[PDB]
Amino acid sequence: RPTFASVHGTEVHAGDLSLDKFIDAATLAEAPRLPAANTQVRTVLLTGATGFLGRYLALEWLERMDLVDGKLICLVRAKSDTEARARLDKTFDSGDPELLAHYRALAGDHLEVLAGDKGEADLGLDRQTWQRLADTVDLIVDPAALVNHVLPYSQLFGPNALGTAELLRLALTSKIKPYSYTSTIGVADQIPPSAFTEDADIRVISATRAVDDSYANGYSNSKWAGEVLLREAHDLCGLPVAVFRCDMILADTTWAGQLNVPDMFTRMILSLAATGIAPGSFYELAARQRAHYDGLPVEFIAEAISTLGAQSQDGFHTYHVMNPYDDGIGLDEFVDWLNESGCPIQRIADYGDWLQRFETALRALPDRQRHSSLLPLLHNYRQPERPVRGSIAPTDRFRAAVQEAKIGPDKDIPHVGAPIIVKYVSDLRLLGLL
Ligand SMILES: NC(=O)c1ccc[n+]([C@@H]2O[C@H](COP(=O)([O-])OP(=O)(O)OC[C@H]3O[C@@H](n4cnc5c(N)ncnc54)[C@H](OP(=O)(O)O)[C@@H]3O)[C@@H](O)[C@H]2O)c1
């Protein structure tokens, strides 16, 4: 198997990630001469459907396949196909009867679940099944990743970089398949701000990257590696690619009991509500300064990835799925909205004093809350954040495409509002965390 050592073995280079380190010579020689998959999509392969974004993508693609009597195939980690299907059923059994009925209605005719693993040869599938996917899949939608902001690139390489290369083997066999990929705004950690754009080739703007133990270094490197591999594949055979670099993915209001419990935003809301104390400001003071939180609700993101993804046109397109507005809606407003919805929060004016008292209050929480709180991430809040008026990244290509496709209720990128924050509270209560 390809490994971090065989490919990269303190700094890594985009040039390290040639497809010949992952895929056999014959597959690569043949890829330029293969036909494209049919542009009328009737079979979709979705990874990560048990994940937070992935389950919303599963709903999108079940709905889209219902219109054309098609099939959604979900790759799910499990010891058997039976267990895999049970895991995905359980994902949609969250205390919302309408969600469960909607999923069950669509899944009966349009869902296949396969046990497998992106990091394994042939995605962990037997040769007959793998060949069937190679022959039939019209689109790959790939949000699956090990999302962990502490592990090194050496440990995330398997699921996130090699995993991309394994899906590319499938995309480059029998017929060339469009590939929709989720990356992260975090790749910008090592890129000059003026060069970090939707138009750029990631190999040009991020040719060399450092490997170290800083926050999310490994994860952001691993997501960069996927983008680089996709660029290599596009050079070889022109496969359509859509890369969606996402900001923080927020919970959304349609379905009850659907939260990304381990993510840092959920941990923050739970921690504020449970301790009842917030800082005067989460941001550097001037007075409290105008600030913007760069997050988008998941139903919007799933719809945009689906509508604007690689099946929708030819070429290689990168989109910054970010919230660009200078709207003054930041973390301090979220505290105010928590307070206004019956989750009382007292402000401690001095940030340092707040942080010390907050740590003490977190340790006093009962186990279930404490384990899902900000306690393990407090190190990241040692200094207040510098406020930004909009996003750190440009969004012109994404915003134009969202407007042109008339996506969502705003026919535009949405703003965050109080109902999003209130949904965190009502879901945390439903899940027994408040
Ligand atoms: N959430 C965010 O704020 C955020 C921000 C920027 C980018 N993103 C990107 O958005 C995508 C989805 O994020 P998420 O928050 O939905 O993550 P998540 O909830 O942790 O879901 C991860 C999914 O990937 C699957 N997976 C992990 N390793 C795998 C492997 N070796 N083989 C097959 N499947 C594997 C997981 O399966 P199990 O259920 O078996 O673990 C799960 O279904 C990721 O690509 C992430 O980098 C997310």
From Swiss-Prot:
NADP(+) binds at residues 50-54, 77, 87, 117-118, 143-145, 182-183, 219, 223. This enzyme can be applied to the microbial production of fatty alkanes and fatty alcohols that have numerous applications as fuels, fragrances, emollients, plasticizers, thickeners, and detergents. Thus, together with complementing enzymes, the broad substrate specificity and kinetic characteristics of Car opens the road for direct and tailored enzyme-catalyzed conversion of lipids into user-ready chemical commodities. The conversion of fatty acid into aldehyde involves three key steps: adenylation of the bound fatty acid substrate to form an AMP-fatty acyl complex, formation of a thioester linkage between the fatty acyl moiety and the phosphopantetheine prosthetic group, and reduction of the thioester intermediate to the aldehyde. The chain holds residues 732 to 1174 of 1174 of the full protein. This is Carboxylic acid reductase. It comes from Mycobacterium marinum (strain ATCC BAA-535 / M). The N-terminal domain likely catalyzes substrate activation by formation of an initial acyl-AMP intermediate, the central region contains the phosphopantetheine attachment site, and the C-terminal domain catalyzes the reduction by NADPH of the intermediate thioester formed from the attack of the phosphopantetheine thiol at the carbonyl carbon of acyl-AMP. Large-scale domain motions occur between the adenylation and thiolation states. Phosphopantetheine binding alters the orientation of a key Asp, resulting in a productive orientation of the bound nicotinamide. Coiled coil: none annotated. It comes from the Bacteria. Catalyzes the ATP- and NADPH-dependent reduction of carboxylic acids to the corresponding aldehydes. Catalyzes the reduction of a wide range of aliphatic fatty acids (C6-C18) into their corresponding aldehydes. Can also reduce benzoate to benzaldehyde. Has a preference for NADPH over NADH as the electron donor. Belongs to the ATP-dependent AMP-binding enzyme family. Carboxylic acid reductase subfamily. The gene is car.
